[PDB]
Amino acid sequence: GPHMATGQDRVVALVDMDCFFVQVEQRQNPHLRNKPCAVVAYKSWKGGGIIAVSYEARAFGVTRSMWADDAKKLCPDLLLAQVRESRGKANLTKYREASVEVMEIMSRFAVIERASIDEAYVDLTSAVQERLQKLQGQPISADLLPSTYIEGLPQGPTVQKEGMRKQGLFQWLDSLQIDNLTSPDLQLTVGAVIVEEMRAAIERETGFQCSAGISHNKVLAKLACGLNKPNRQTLVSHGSVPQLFSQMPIRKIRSLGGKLGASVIEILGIEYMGELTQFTESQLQSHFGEKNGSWLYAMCRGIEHDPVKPRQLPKTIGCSKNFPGKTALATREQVQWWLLQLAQELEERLTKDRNDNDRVATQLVVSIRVQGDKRLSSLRRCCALTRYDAHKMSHDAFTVIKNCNTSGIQTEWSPPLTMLFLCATKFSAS
DNA sequence: ATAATGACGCT
DNA sequence: AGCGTCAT
Ligand SMILES: Nc1nc2c(ncn2[C@H]2C[C@H](O)[C@@H](COP(=O)(O)NP(=O)(O)OP(=O)(O)O)O2)c(=O)[nH]1
Ligand SMILES: [Mn+2]
Ligand SMILES: [Mn+2]
Numbered sequence: 319g320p321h322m323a324t325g326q327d328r329v330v331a332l333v334d335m336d337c338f339f340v341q342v343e344q345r346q347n348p349h350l351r352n353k354p355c356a357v358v359a360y361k362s363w364k365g366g367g368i369i370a371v372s373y374e375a376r377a378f379g380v381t382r383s384m385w386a387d388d389a390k391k392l393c394p395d396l397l398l399a400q401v402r403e404s405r406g407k408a409n410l411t412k413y414r415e416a417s418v419e420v421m422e423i424m425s426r427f428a429v430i431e432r433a434s435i436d437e438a439y440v441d442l443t444s445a446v447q448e449r450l451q452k453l454q455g456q457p458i459s460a461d462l463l464p465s466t467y468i469e470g471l472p473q474g475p476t477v478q479k480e481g482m483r484k485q486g487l488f489q490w491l492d493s494l495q496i497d498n499l500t501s502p503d504l505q506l507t508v509g510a511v512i513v514e515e516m517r518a519a520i521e522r523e524t525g526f527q528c529s530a531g532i533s534h535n536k537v538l539a540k541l542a543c544g545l546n547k548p549n550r551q552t553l554v555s556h557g558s559v560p561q562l563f564s565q566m567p568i569r570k571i572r573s574l575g576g577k578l579g580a581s582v583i584e585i586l587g588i589e590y591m592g593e594l595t596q597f598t599e600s601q602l603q604s605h606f607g608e609k610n611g612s613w614l615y616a617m618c619r620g621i622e623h624d625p626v627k628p629r630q631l632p633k634t635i636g637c638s639k640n641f642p643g644k645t646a647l648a649t650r651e652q653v654q655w656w657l658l659q660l661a662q663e664l665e666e667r668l669t670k671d672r673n674d675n676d677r678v679a680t681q682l683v684v685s686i687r688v689q690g691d692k693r694l695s696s697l698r699r700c701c702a703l704t705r706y707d708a709h710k711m712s713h714d715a716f717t718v719i720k721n722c723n724t725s726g727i728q729t730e731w732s733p734p735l736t737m738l739f740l741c742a743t744k745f746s747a748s
Numbered sequence: 749a750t751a752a753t754g755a756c757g758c759t
Numbered sequence: 760a761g762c763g764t765c766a767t
Contacts, residue, residue: 334767359751367750369767382767383750401752408752434754434767576765609757634754642749698761739753 325534325621326502326556329446329509332539333424333517334437335528336548339370342416343399345525354378355397358386359408365390366400373548405659407639410435411667419524421630427516429628436528437543439536440516441626442509449508450499457496460487462511467546470558490553503555506532510553517551535622537572559620563591571617578610594618631675637664638685638739646689646734650723653731653738657715660740661708668706668742679703679742684715686722687737695739697722703742715740 335341339357344350354375358366365386378393390396402409417435424430424438431439471486495501513530521527530551531542542554554562568591569579583589585605586597594602595618603611616622637660647653672678682703685695699718703711725732 338767363749369751385750410752436767573765578764632754636753638752640749640751642751645749693763695762700760741753 323621324502324556325616325619325623327443328534329442329505330533330535330539330626331440331442331509331513332433332437332531332536332543333440333513333520333528334434334530334543334547335420335526337370337372338416338436338526339401339413340372340399341526342413344372346412347399350397350399353397354380354393354395355399356380356386356389357401358398359401360403361386361400364388365398369401405662406656407659407663409663416524416526420520420526420528423520423523424516425630426519427512429626430630431627432630432632438630439539439626440513442512442532443505445512446505446508447499449512450505453508455496458491458494458507458511460484460491463487463507463514465514465517465550466510467550467552469542469545469552469554470561502534503557506534506553506555510551513551534620536624536626537617537622538620540572541566541570556620560592563618563620566591578606582606582614591618633745634741634743635664635667635671635679636739636741637667638737641734641736641738646736647738648731648734650720650725650729650731653735654712654716656738657740658708658712660738661711661715664711664740664742665706665708672706672748676748677745678748679745681742681744682711682715683741683743684719685737685739685741686719686735688722689734689736691733691736695737703744711740 340355343357352374355372356368356375357370358368360366368380368382368384368386368389371380371382375393375396380389380393380396386398402412413435421430421432421438424440428440428442428445433439466487467483468486468490471489472482476482476485494507495504498504510532513532517528517530527549529543529547529549531539531554532551533539533542533554534556538554542552545552567589568583569575571591574582588594594614599611599615602614606614639656639660641647647656668679680703681700683698683700685698687696697719701714701718723731
């Protein structure tokens with residue numbers, strides 16, 4: 319009734335770059351602009367695995383996870399860009415540095431939560447209240463929202479894609495309660511005006527294009543972000559959630575794409591997000607635990623309370639390489655060498671981190687995977703990070719895993735390692 | 749035999 | 760402390 323919290327207290331946006339690693343290479347090499355192209359790591363095996371696909375190549379069916387030699391079967395004119403290699407491994411420095419350019423522009427508008435290398439969450443609540451008071455009381459022109467989609471509109475009593483957008487935008491704006499600085503739909507509209515400005519600044523200042531989702535919480539803005547990619551932004555209001563969730567497959571919601579989402583489907587016998595509304599919170603707490611139960615119950619009414627954390631820098635700095643198949647490390651010296659290669663790149667990035675952000679990692683986590691195991695990591699161990707010295711980090715990382723060699727021979731290493739991963743963490747103000 | 753990372757929950 | 764999940 320009057321005491322049902324509708325999850326409309328905040329304005330939150332999710333900006334995510336369109337085919338990010340591809341845009342970075344396309345800005346650098348103009349010959350790849352507006353062409354089907356992909357980014358690839360390691361051209362030896364089947365031409366390398368594809369990690370990012372432009373939208374022109376997606377049109378032919380090229381996806382990430384594909385081998386470049388298979389993607390050229392689907393698209394013969396596919397242009398490839400290969401990631402820098404340093405010390406025998408992929409090096410993502412170019413994209414990290416591109417990512418920092420974008421984070422700094424978004425930071426100028428609001429406090430952001432770096433959520434990946436190519437996306438950040440924005441909490442625009444206060445900026446919305448600020449803009450609402452300098453607007454005095456003026457209506458909101460559709461000229462302020464040249465790339466916004468209003469999810470669920472048009473509705474009621476034009477055949478092309480941009481025609482629909484306008485007529486949906488017009489309908490929304492025609493309906494807008496301009497008088498009421500408290501109406502949550504007006505605030506989203508104003509959030510969306512700010513996000514247009516911020517997306518323009520990103521494109522003006524980096525040449526990168528991105529999509530954005532604007533809703534009342536992180537989960538809805540993330541889902542909204544995907545609805546009109548690329549180069550568009552989508553407003554999802556509280557009232558569009560019922561129709562939106564009635565055919566929304568469960569797995570498309572953040573944190574439900576895995577086994578939890580699969581057990582919601584199998585146990586509860588449903589397919590779509592909107593179907594969860596029939597269960598009581600207690601029922602959902604019984605099947606999925608108190609925390610998930612409560613979260614599911616509020617979520618399927620479009621209510622979510624996870625806050626935008628004020629974090630623009632990563633909490634961990636990490637460095638890993640896989641060794642699949644016959645290339646799995648099988649001798650002690652081979653393990654030592656790569657641990658040193660990984661420690662060396664970690665050292666350049668730590669030293670850069672300490673001068674740019676004046677903090678220092680204090681703990682070093684070593685994780686490995688053995689051949690024949692099944693999980694991502696097979697063993698995690700940890701020691702102290704006192705000096706930014708690769709040889710010490712290499713030595714210490716080896717020390718705390720060497721007892722895992724079931725090899726009777728000192729020279730050999732079994733079982734063969736298929737993943738080495740080093741991660742500096744527990745950062746303190748420096 | 750896509751890889752390379754990063755955040756966070758559970759016990 | 761060390762493992763498990765979910766993610767881009
Ligand atoms: N190495 C590696 N990189 C990945 C992986 N997944 C993503 N990346 C890297 C490369 C990706 O470019 C970058 C951004 O990831 P997204 O936002 O999920 N997809 P993008 O921005 O490319 O397309 P869209 O327009 O659909 O958002 O993360 C992966 O599994 N492995
Ligand atoms: Mn992206
Ligand atoms: Mn992303």
